[PDB]
């Protein structure tokens, strides 16, 4: 997260770190007792690798009573996802067992009504992704508030130009933005999950290249089907 601030410890009980061979890779969001939602491209790079999900965490490295590492029973990438498209970029991880719920570990309700978040709405994005332009990695969860940027605008030419479908939403990236390593994590507006940070490569913190977030309401049948 660029241009943000350290998050209040455990104030986002839904926040997950998706890890590969013991290291943070991508964010993710606890959406049911046994299921974490993240981005598919994060795990394109993976089959030779143990995937785990850290819940209840603020620090990546220090112990905390609430902090618990869960093995993964199943990774389920969206069926229409492909390398080199930003579209359908979601992944569901089934935890090995139901997460132990408490004040620090709780699922986030997510948007099921397929209507865009109004332009200018301030939404919150959190992650353990890079915090500057050098590539520095924080130990502790960071977060930033970003205004949603209308789709009509996001499709303009010196922007993202053509790609942004009805299943994607955009937010401003003017010095405050999500970046590499924040992919898969939550964009939350009025306390509901609205988007998941996309995992394509892109520059961070440049006003001319807005953040892209996959709209979870667009995918509500698929998410229901997987959990069922
Ligand atoms: O390499 C990644 N994380 C490494 C990291 C850890 C901590 C901070 C910063 C970076 N993640 C990805 C892997 C494949 C495709 C997309 C992404 C992605 O994050 O968009």
Contact of 105 with 99, CB cutoff 8 Å: yes
User: How many whole angstroms separate alpha carbon 138 and alpha carbon 154?
Assistant: 29
86, 212 Cβ separation under 8 angstroms:
yes
Catalytic status, residue 89: yes
Per-residue CA distances from 47 to 22, 54, 225 (Å): 14, 19, 24
Phi/psi of residue 41, nearest 5 degrees: -65, -30
Distance CA 180, CA 25 (A): 9
Distance (Å, whole) CA 67 – CA 10: 10
Return d(Cα 18, Cα 29) in angstroms, integer.
Answer: 9
Among this protein's residues, is 183 annotated catalytic?
yes
Pick the CATH number of 13-107+218-228 from 3.40.50.2300, 3.30.565.10, 2.40.10.10, 2.40.50.140: 2.40.10.10
Q: List 168's β-bridge partners, or say none.
A: 214
- Within the chain, how many helices (H) and strands (E) appear? 3, 13
Deposited resolution, Å: 1.6
Q: Which of 80, 70, 85 is nearest to 36 (CA)?
A: 70
Residue 188 phi/psi, 5° resolution?
A: -115, 130
Spatial distance between the Cα atoms of 220 and 178, rounded to a whole number of angstroms: 24
Q: Where in the chain is the domain with CATH 2.40.10.10?
A: 1-12+108-217, 13-107+218-228
- Residue 137, ligand 1, Cβ within 6 A: yes
Ligand 1 atom closest to Cα of residue 129: 8
184 Cα–ligand 1 center, Å: 9
Cβ(31) – ligand 1 distance below 6 Å = no
Q: Say which residue the tokens 């009805």 belong to.
A: 166
Q: Nearest-5° angle of CA 155, CA 158, CA 164?
A: 20
Beta bridge partner(s), residue 53:
18, 70
For domain 1-12+108-217, the CATH architecture is: Beta Barrel (2.40)
Q: What DSSP state is assigned to residue 153?
A: H
Q: Which tokens in the block code for residue 159?
A: 């922007």
Kindly tell me the sign of the dihedral angle through the C-alpha atoms of 104, 145, 139, 181: positive
* Structure tokens belonging to residue 53: 């999900």
Judge if the beta carbon of residue 41 lies within 6 A of ligand 1.
Answer: yes
CB 104 within 8 A of CB 56: yes
Method: X-ray
Q: Catalogue the long-range contacts made by 63-68 (C-beta closer than 8 Å, 24 or more residues apart).
A: 64/9, 64/104, 65/104, 66/10, 66/102, 66/103, 66/104, 66/105, 68/99, 68/100, 68/105
Burial code (b: 16+ CB inside 10 Å, e: under 16) for 122-146 equals ebbbbbbbbbeeeeeebeebbbbeb
State both tokens at 81. Answer: 């996802």
Smallest CA-to-CA distance from 199 within 226, 168, 174, 172 is with: 168
- What are 123's two structure tokens? 């939404």
141, 108 in Cβ contact below 8 A?
no
């Amino acid at each position: 997260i660029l241009g943000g601030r350290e998050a209040e410890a455990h104030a986002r009980p839904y926040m997950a770190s998706v890890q590969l061979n013991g290291a943070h890779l991508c964010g993710g969001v606890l959406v049911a007792e046994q299921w974490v939602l993240s981005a598919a491209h994060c795990l394109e790079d993976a089959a030779d690798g143990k995937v785990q999900v850290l819940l209840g965490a603020h620090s990546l490295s220090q112990p905390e009573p609430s902090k618990r590492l869960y093995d993964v029973l199943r990774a389920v990438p969206h069926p229409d996802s492909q390398p080199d498209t930003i579209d359908h970029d979601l992944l569901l991880l089934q935890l090995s067992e139901k997460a132990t719920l408490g004040p620090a570990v709780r699922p986030l309700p997510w948007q099921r009504v397929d209507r865009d978040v109004a332009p200018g709405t301030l939404c919150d994005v959190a992650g353990w992704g890079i915090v500057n332009h050098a590539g520095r990695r924080p130990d502790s969860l960071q977060h930033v508030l970003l205004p949603v940027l209308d789709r009509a605008t996001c499709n303009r030419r010196t922007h993202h130009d053509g790609a942004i479908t009805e299943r994607l939403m955009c937010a401003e990236s003017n010095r405050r933005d999500s970046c590499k390593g924040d992919s898969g994590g939550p964009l939350v507006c009025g306390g509901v999950l609205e988007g998941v940070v996309t995992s394509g490569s892109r520059v961070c913190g440049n006003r001319k290249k807005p953040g892209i977030y996959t709209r979870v309401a667009s995918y509500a049948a698929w998410i229901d089907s997987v959990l069922a």
